[PDB]
Amino acid sequence: LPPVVSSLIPFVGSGLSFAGGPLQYTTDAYKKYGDIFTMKVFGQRLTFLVGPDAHVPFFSQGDAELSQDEPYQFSVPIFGPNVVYGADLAHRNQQLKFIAASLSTKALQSYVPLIVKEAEDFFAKWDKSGTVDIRDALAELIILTASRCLMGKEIRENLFTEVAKLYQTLDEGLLPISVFFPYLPIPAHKRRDEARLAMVRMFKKIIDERRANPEVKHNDCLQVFMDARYRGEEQALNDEEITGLMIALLFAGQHTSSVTGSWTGLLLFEANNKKKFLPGVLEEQEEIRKEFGDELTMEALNKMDKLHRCVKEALRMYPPLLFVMRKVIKPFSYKDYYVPEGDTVFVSPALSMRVEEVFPNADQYNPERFVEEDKQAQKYRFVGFGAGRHGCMGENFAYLQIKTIWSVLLRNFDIELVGELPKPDYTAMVVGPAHPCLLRYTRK
Numbered sequence: 126l127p128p129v130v131s132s133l134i135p136f137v138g139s140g141l142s143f144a145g146g147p148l149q150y151t152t153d154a155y156k157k158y159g160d161i162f163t164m165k166v167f168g169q170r171l172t173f174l175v176g177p178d179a180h181v182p183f184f185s186q187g188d189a190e191l192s193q194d195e196p197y198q199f200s201v202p203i204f205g206p207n208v209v210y211g212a213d214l215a216h217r218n219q220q221l222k223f224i225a226a227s228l229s230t231k232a233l234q235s236y237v238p239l240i241v242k243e244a245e246d247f248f249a250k251w252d253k254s255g256t257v258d259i260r261d262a263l264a265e266l267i268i269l270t271a272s273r274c275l276m277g278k279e280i281r282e283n284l285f286t287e288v289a290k291l292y293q294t295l296d297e298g299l300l301p302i303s304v305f306f307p308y309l310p311i312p313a314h315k316r317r318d319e320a321r322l323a324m325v326r327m328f329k330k331i332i333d334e335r336r337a338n339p340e341v342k343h344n345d346c347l348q349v350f351m352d353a354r355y356r357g358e359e360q361a362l363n364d365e366e367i368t369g370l371m372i373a374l375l376f377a378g379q380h381t382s383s384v385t386g387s388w389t390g391l392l393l394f395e396a397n398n399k400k401k402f403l404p405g406v407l408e409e410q411e412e413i414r415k416e417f418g419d420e421l422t423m424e425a426l427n428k429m430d431k432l433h434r435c436v437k438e439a440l441r442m443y444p445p446l447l448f449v450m451r452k453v454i455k456p457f458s459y460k461d462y463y464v465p466e467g468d469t470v471f472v473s474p475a476l477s478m479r480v481e482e483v484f485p486n487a488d489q490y491n492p493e494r495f496v497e498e499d500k501q502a503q504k505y506r507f508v509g510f511g512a513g514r515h516g517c518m519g520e521n522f523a524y525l526q527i528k529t530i531w532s533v534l535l536r537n538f539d540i541e542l543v544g545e546l547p548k549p550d551y552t553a554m555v556v557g558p559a560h561p562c563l564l565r566y567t568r569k
């Protein structure tokens with residue numbers, strides 16, 4: 126035999142995210158076999174859990190029973206060394222607490238004026254009338270807004286173009302092959318590795334300058350991460366870790382929020398949906414303005430229930446992450462069944478939120494379904510943001526970002542969907558509406 130230079134058997138599960146959106150295939154298997162079933166690929170067992178009952182083992186178990194490490198291995202060379210899914214549990218859990226602190230109610234209270242100002246300025250630059258790719262526009266606004274709230278005023282105001290380009294290069298580094306072989310030495314991965322080091326060099330300058338002026342307070346996630354302490358350690362996080370936590374929140378928060386922001390508009394301003402649901406949403410904006418005035422405050426955004434439900438219903442019908450997945454560390458029972466050590470378990474928010482028994486007329490747009498649904502006591506029915514221990518920590522931020530966007534648009538423009546509702550684009554790990562995603566707008 127000629128020389129064998131390497132022999133690899135990678136974890137296959139993360140591959141589902143780049144399988145071109147096999148929802149109808151998995152739906153067909155659900156309708157035949159029921160709420161728990163297994164596919165084998167190269168002898169690796171992939172076990173699916175559909176609907177609230179089957180969700181319980183997935184969302185109610187913890188790190189000792191279900192592991193994120195294998196599913197999120199792709200992220201380790203993106204976020205950097207000893208960051209989140211590249212850290213041991215002891216450090217990981219502490220880092221997730223620092224992120225929780227940066228996205229708390231208190232933190233959001235301070236971010237909201239910054240979100241509102243970026244949105245108002247952004248849409249104030251629009252022509253009197255025209256046609257816009259809402260997905261391209263909202264991706265632009267959402268990276269501007271995150272550069273301010275996550276990274277702080279220095280980077281937003283001086284280095285936006287530089288930091289946006291570094292992020293773009295990390296985004297371009299995540300290929301299908303990347304989830305099987307995160308360390309494969311290809312050009313896209315070399316560019317990724319250089320872009321991450323370049324970002325660390327950029328944050329090192331801001332951090333060093335902030336510590337040289339420790340009286341100067343900052344309303345950003347960077348300040349929370351600079352103040353952060355590991356238990357029984359006086360030394361702060363190093364620059365690589367602080368930078369890694371930023372990149373993690375860009376990956377968590379950018380495409381998810383911009384695709385959900387985009388579907389919110391494309392669905393609501395579709396001719397039939399617009400006739401039914403727009404009047405209520407416009408009425409709500411008037412009632413909000415009568416009670417609170419014109420300032421978009423935390424308090425006023427929190428009262429926009431009908432707009433909130435329009436976002437939630439876009440997320441129900443077109444979740445940006447088709448799968449969440451865990452490696453099974455400890456076997457468990459679900460009803461009559463046994464799920465063995467070594468299985469990969471999946472929940473598809475896409476599948477689970479088209480279950481008729483949970484969501485009647487699941488393929489119909491009906492944001493007012495959530496008046497009744499929000500009263501239901503049964504856990505894990507709506508799983509757009511996941512659930513349980515590793516449930517989305519950005520949920521409240523996401524709702525404030527998207528409701529701010531559509532508040533500013535609804536108050537200032539008449540909007541129509543151009544042509545047919547876009548179909549989902551299943552080419553990346555975040556699913557969004559296929560370009561072109563055109564809305565026609567006219568100032569009021």
Ligand code: HEM
Pocket residue numbers: 193221224228374377378379381382385440445446449450508509510511512514515516517518519520522523
């Ligand atoms: C509409 C937009 C969003 C959706 C649909 C979404 C969805 C999700 C989902 C499904 C998870 C669970 C992942 C898993 O179980 O493995 C999650 C986790 C998370 N999301 Fe979001 N997310 C959104 C926006 C954001 C934003 C804006 C941020 C940050 C600003 C963010 C930060 C996170 C974090 C930190 C986690 C990790 C929780 C953990 O591992 O403990 N998300 N997100």
Ligand SMILES: CCCCCCCCCCCCO[C@@H]1O[C@H](CO)[C@@H](O[C@H]2O[C@H](CO)[C@@H](O)[C@H](O)[C@H]2O)[C@H](O)[C@H]1O
Pocket residue numbers: 200209224296297299373374376377380384550552553554555556557
């Ligand atoms: C603290 C823990 C953090 C948890 C981390 C969670 C990670 C979340 C994974 C996000 C992965 C994003 O994946 C990203 O998807 C978007 C599209 O949506 C792609 O975006 C790019 O390609 C797509 C098509 O492929 C285009 O439509 C898009 O306009 C373009 O900019 C990126 O090329 C891809 O990298």
